Structures are given as C-alpha cells and as structure tokens.
Amino acid sequence: LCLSQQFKAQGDYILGGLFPLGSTEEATLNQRTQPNSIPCNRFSPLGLFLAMAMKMAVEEINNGSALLPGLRLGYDLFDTCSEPVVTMKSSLMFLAKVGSQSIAAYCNYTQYQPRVLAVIGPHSSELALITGKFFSFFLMPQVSYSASMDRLSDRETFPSFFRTVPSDRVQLQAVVTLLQNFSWNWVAALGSDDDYGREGLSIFSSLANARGICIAHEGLVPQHDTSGQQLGKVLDVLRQVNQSKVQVVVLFASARAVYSLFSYSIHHGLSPKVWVASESWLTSDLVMTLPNIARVGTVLGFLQRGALLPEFSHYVETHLALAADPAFCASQRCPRCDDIMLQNLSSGLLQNLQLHHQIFATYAAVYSVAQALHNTLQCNVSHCHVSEHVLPWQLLENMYNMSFHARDLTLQFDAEGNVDMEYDLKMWVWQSPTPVLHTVGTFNGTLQLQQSKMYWPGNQVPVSQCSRQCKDGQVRRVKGFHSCCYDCVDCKAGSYRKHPDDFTCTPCNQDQWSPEKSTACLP
Amino acid sequence: SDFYLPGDYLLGGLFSLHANMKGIVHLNFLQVPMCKEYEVKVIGYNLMQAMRFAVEEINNDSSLLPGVLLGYEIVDVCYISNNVQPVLYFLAHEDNLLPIQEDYSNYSSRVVAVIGPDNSESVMTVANFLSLFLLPQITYSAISDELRDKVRFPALLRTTPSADHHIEAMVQLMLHFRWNWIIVLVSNDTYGRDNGQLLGERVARRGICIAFQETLPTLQPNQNMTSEERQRLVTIVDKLQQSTARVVVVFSPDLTLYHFFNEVLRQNFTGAVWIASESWAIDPVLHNLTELRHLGTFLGITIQSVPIPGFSEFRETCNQECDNCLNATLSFNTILRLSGERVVYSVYSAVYAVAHALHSLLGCDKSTCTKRVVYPWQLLEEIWKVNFTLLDHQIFFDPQGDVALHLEIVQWQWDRSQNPFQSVASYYPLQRQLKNIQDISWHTINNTIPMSMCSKRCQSGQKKKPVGIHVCCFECIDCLPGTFLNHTEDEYECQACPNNEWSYQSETSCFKRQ
C-alpha cells in the first residue's frame, strides 16, 4: 500500500494531529544511554481509525460551503507511539516556524509564526498532561478526543486545553445522583491499583461528602491474577465489605480486575449486592461471560451517548482500496500502514466497533477547530477577512464561547474546556439465558429513571442507608470512612441519657430506676 | 553580572528567586512572564550564591579542571511559571534556534549540564524536555518519589534524600516519644496532597492514628484576604482548639503559613508540637515572627549541616536579573551566618559532581586537559560513575539517582548569637534509622515530654474495646470473675478459666476452685 504518504495534505491553515498510530517493542523499556531514534515498528489499528476520522472530517469541511468558504484546510499527522520522547519531538516540530525545522527561544513572540494552527491532542492522559504544559505556554489551542483526567480542567496550568470527551467528574456526578435517587446512602467504593484507579476514588469520595453519601469502605483491587498476596488483599476487602453491612458497591476498576474479583466471589459465594460500574468496566465481555454470574447480584452503569457516523466504514474501505491502487501513486509517519492487509482488519474491527464515540469525538474536534477559525475570520457565506493570517493565540480567544454542529449534535466548550454531554443508564437483566442490557434511564445534567423497567432480586428495591439523626433518647456513635453517619443505640433500662447528643449513657443511682431510652431516673 | 560567566563549558542553573503560588504560567501578552513581580525569596538567592561560589572554587582549584574554565548560565524559574523558555534557551544554538532532528548524538547544546529547579513540578517538566537530548539534570531539593523512575526520567539525578526518608524520620520521631494521636495540615497543591498521602500510607502500618487531615487555603502574605478565607482559617484553628491531638504535622510552603500562624496567635491557641516539613523547616522569615515562640515547640525535618569554609564570607536572556535580592539578604545575613549550610551543600555537591564527571570525560591529567567537544549524553554517562569525598562525605549516586545525605530533626530557637535551628536528632538513610536524639526544650512546666494518645493504657487484666474508626482508640473493661486476660494471647476479650479454676473481678490468671 501507499498510505503513510497520505497523513499529510496541503492547505492554507494546517491542523496538527497526535495519534496512537504506532507502538514499540518491549526492548525499548530499558534506560536510554544514547539519544538515537526510537523504533516504533509495531502496528496499531486504533490510531489508523482515529486518523481516518480526522481525514474524513477535514474532507467534509473542504467540500461544504457551510464552513470556511473559499479556502482550503490542511493537516499533517504524527504517531505518539505512546512514548513521551517521540510525542515531544512531534510537538516541537509542530511549534517550529513555518518553512523551517527549528524552534526559537525568543523572549517576545509578538510576530512568531508556527507551522500549525491547532493540535488535535493525544489519546492518553499522561501524554495529554506532558504536551499540555508545552502547548499552553505558547497558547496553542489543543483539542483532545480522549483525555478525561480531572487535573486537565485547571485553566491556570492548562489555559489552552480542550477536550470532546467529558471528564471523569461528570460520570461520578451521574453515579452520585443515582445513589441519591434511591437513597443508597451507605456504600463501599473500590478501584484499581493504578493512578486512575484511585484518582477516581478520590473524586468520588470528595463528591460524596458534599451530598451525604457515606463512603463506608474504601480499597484498591489488583489486575494481576497471579499475585497471591494481592489476592489476599482482595479476600480481606471482600470480608470487610461483607462485615460492613453495606448493600451497594461502587467499582471504578479495570475490566480484568473486576473479572478476578468477581470470579473469586463466585467460587466462595459472597453475598448479593448492587454493583455500580464505570465507562472503563461496562458492557464488559469477560465479566458478563462469567460461569454463574447470578451470585453477583444487580449490575448498573452510565455510558456516553455518541452520535452515529454511518458513512465511516465505507470511507475507510474506499481509502484502503485507493491506497492499494497502483495508479493512485500519482496523487515514516507509520511504517506498517504500507504493509498492513486490506480485508480482515478493516472488516472485523469496524464490525466489532468505546471506539465508535471516540471516532466521533475526533470528528467533533476537527469541526470545533474549523468553526472557531470560521468565527475568527468572521466569514460570510461567501466572504472571509483573508487580509491576515490567523495566529494560534487568536483562535483561543474565540474558542471558549463558540458552538459547533458536529453532525446532528450541537456542542459547546464550557468555562473549563469541557463539552456538554449526556449519558444513558444501563442495567443488566442477568436472568435470561444470556445477560441483556436495558436503558433504565438517562443523565442530562439531571437524572431521569424509567422505574417501570427495572428488575430487583427480591422484586423490591435494595437498601443500605444509615441513620444520621437520632431520637433525643438515643445515643450516637460514629461510623464510616469519614464521620458522616451514626448508628443510634437505645440505652438500656437502669441508665439514662443526660443530654440528647451525649456519646454515652449514664447509670442511675441505687435509689432509682429507669425504663429504656429514658433521659431521667425515677425512685 | 552575577547570572553570567563565560567559559569553555557552561552549566545551566534554575533557581526560584521570585515565587508566587498563584501566577501566570502562560505567555503574558505574548511575552515571557515577568518574574520580578513575585516578591523575592531569600533561600533561592542563597542557593544561587552557593552555585556561584562552587564554580569560583572550581576555577581556583587548579587540581580539578587544570586550564579549563568553567562557566554558568543562570536563569530564575518562578515556581511553575517560566519553565519552558529557560530549557529552549539552554538547548538552542548560538543564534537561539533549536533544530529538530531524528538523532541528536552529535548535537552540541549551549550548556553541558543543568542544576535543576528546587521544586518537583518544575523538575519533572524540565526533565521531560531534557530526556529527549539526554542532557544531565542534577536536582538539589526535589524530594518527590516519582523521580526515582529512570524509565520516565533517564537523565535526572539528585543530591538529596527522597520524600520516603523524610516521612520515615517523622514517623520514627513520633514513635520514639510515643505520639499515637496526631493532626496533619496540608497545602492546596501537589506537594501537600502527595506528602500527606505518603504520611498516611506509612502511618497506617505503624500504629499511629490521625485525628484529621485539613487543607489550608492558598493565601499570600501581602494580600488582604476575603471574609470567606478568614472564616476558613478560623474554622481550621477552632478544629485544632477542640481536638485532643497536640501534635501537628504541616506540609505547606512558607508563603501560605504566614496568615495561618497569625490567626493561631490571635486565637490564643498554645501547647502543641509543630512538625515542619523541609519546605518551611529552616525558613528565616517565619522564624523572625518573634511571638510565634508562644505557640509551642517547633520541630522540623531538614538536611544535615555541612559547614562550607569561605561561603559565609562570599555571601557578604530574559528573567536574568534581580534588584531586591541583595537588600533582602543583607537583613537576614546574621541569621544565615548562624544557620548551618544545609541545602547549600546539595547545590555545592551537585556542581562538584558535574566538575568531576567533566574532569573524567576529558581524560584530564593532574596537569592538563585535552579540550574536546563534549556531547551531554557522555557527561551523563560519566556522572553516573563519580565517587569522591568533598567535605568528609562520600558523594555517589545509587542506582536510582540519589546521594544518601543524612537528615536531621531540628528545634527552633529564639536566642541570638547562637544557632537558630539546633540539631536534636540525626537520621541515617542507608540504615533507615533515627539516632542520637539530644535534649529538647519542651513547653511543659518541668520540661516533661508532651503527650498525645487517643486514650490511656488500661489497667492490668483489663480488656480493650474499640471506638470509632481508629485502631488507637479504645475503652477499658474489666474481665469479670471466671475470666482472665493474658494480654500476650489477646487484649480485646478475656480467656475463660478451666473447670477446676476461677478468677477474681480482674486478674491475669485463675486460681484453683472446687
């Protein structure tokens, strides 16, 4: 094939693109001793599909009169290789001067001219953090189709970072609203051993205290089935959860971690609970294909509602065919893209097509940049103010208050560079011969539940709540990972409660007696 | 000027001469952020002077780089602001252009090594760039543990122990004096969150319990605060007031504490042990708050003192200037001269490490060096191997990039003409041990050790019953007749006597009975 040649195209304004368009062998994991070129010989289809989405968006924009009339939009794409060094090389090339392979250390950039107008950012949060500082120093507008870490919202450190996938905070807010709706006030929270694994739990624990939910228990779970000591940790976690009298569990972990935990729970039986999933662990094939999943109980989770791109697969097939055509030569950034075969991947992976709405997110990012440029040029339906060349820092002023029409949706960037988005709530009916998912409700900044469609193990809603208030005759004693709720104790006869918020009960004197829950003694 | 010294080989230097916790990270009206707006820092200027003195020493010492002139190119980072342009300037060619290339092995950058920033965020941000070229970066005061990852940071080394050792020193100090019950206060930034989380992790396994962990607002000394922030501070101080834990561990910058302690002063709070982290353990400015001495006992974790001869006398292209630094230093001159040179030694040893590595790289003799075009990756390769004594201490980097300097616990003193920061204990990191705990002047009447525990130890034969979350918190209950409590078998439930034995209302063992 001749396909690596097609990741660059001419135009009046050029978009940069960082994609997971390659990978490196494990031998690269050692400490580098000499600054030689890092090999990235290992193919990645995900990056290919994302780059094709960007190309399709730019082609649509170049054909229509609705955006940027009478001028051509260009691009050139690079592989991040999931490697910070290669990513840094790519970004430094992006900020180099027009027509030159070098970047300037000036003090004043009042007439500097870098070669790209905007950069469509990387697929992972680590590289997003690494590149965002650099890009946002220069006020280069950057748009990420997948970087959900909350830390990226900070406008002080990332003044020019935008994304078209919601932050994790919105998903956890939806979960918290779901917990409030059923008054599932007393909960246990689990996550993976990795950074994301407790970043999620930190955000959830911060959210819970602001709204009442009592995080009774916290912990991390491994994704390493062979690690016997960490399996000891998971056994301890499950015994603790069972001992806590909790009935609802929030589980932010990765798919394999949940698979391990649930398999162990199957074998030693555990007890049924309500498990609340995450975009990471949802529609999980391995988890749903458990031998006897019924021992788990109810399973729920929120999932993003990305719009359709019906023409995408035919576009990919068409362009792979064109890359196979020997005449098309008349028309590396990816070494294996020229080797990879046509049929099986492009068919099967797009039939298997998480991937779909990230493709849509890339498309929407391209459209966001195009609409921002359209506003900045103040284009008419047939005019633009082309007397000047728009510098990147001039887009940034116009990108915060825009709205862009991605396909059928209308979208905006909020004050923190995060898009408005809505979720479906999906629940597992596990009792059919194979488990089935149903859309129990939706979240659009507020939660709507179709109560009539849900199922429960006892045909009645499970409960976990703990008391916070107590009667004037009841002693209060703290419980919870935080001091959020109290289990009331009715003081026994022969003792009295001296005042309604004391934490102990006092015996009566020998000449006196008292009934239960009394505040006083009688002779 | 003080920031520039031409020579055959140039060291890059990044110091926080001016700092504000809230600042412009990005281009300001499309010009590099102006640093001199953000007040001025005594310790940062002191460390810059330490580097300058080190290079002057090396140029005087004919035995270390004979006939080779060593120079420096010093640029002041501004905490997290002004991080990128200094790196671009250091890596660029003589005409301030940096070419992008596939392979950099033959590329001669302006400087051969960077004496990196004092703070963790800047250190990692700079290391991201410098790993591309494998230009060595020696860091003097960043304690974050993530810097030990040599996959992420192949070119980063340190002349100071890691955060783990500081937290270990804290924990062992608390265990020695039997403080089971403590409070942790953290700043609203990465430093406080990370260090507080690390302390929590290490505390969980050692039998110490935390009353609460509380976040301070990011105020500034010369900034008038809102009523909301004033009420926030009042809330924190009131929560301190009503708590039984009289040991407080503070993970905060110095700037954010000025308002805090002032509040604590006007609230009439007294009688606590304040454990300072190295971020403010030896700050002259906070020490000069003369009435602060009424708030209790002030202890801090810091680097060991290594006196540098001649540095005391020595102390008597945008963002390469400071105006107020000299005037500020002259006022604290006496306190600095009476203080031990603690982090200054990290800076000194970093410069000498670069000097020795370059001395080896040039194949230089006692008498002469064959000057050669140095490419920084070879100098990094050499820096990994240096092994020498500078001032009675062996300077070498462990496989994870740290020099194992001793840590010390210090008590603040407000007498004058003797040391502001007295050394009361010494922590050896290669042994993981706290040792030589000397006399401490407590705030108590007869100088008794101040106590903090959730509850008193039970009487003999008396079983524990837990309360709340904390393992440390328990109440004592008598083992009623017929039951006994050998505390080495269990402490929360009594044993039962054999059929031929009985026990009194509370005892460790039974007696024979019909």
Ligand SMILES: COC(=O)[C@H](Cc1ccccc1)NC(=O)[C@H](CC(=O)O)NCCCc1ccc(OC)c(O)c1
């Ligand atoms: C985010 O961390 C922090 O804000 C704090 C405070 C800080 C902010 C800006 C510049 C320096 C320090 N960092 C630290 O204390 C780091 C550890 C780390 O940063 O991991 N150890 C420095 C110990 C000697 C020191 C040198 C320079 C000083 O002033 C320029 C100073 O006061 C203290």
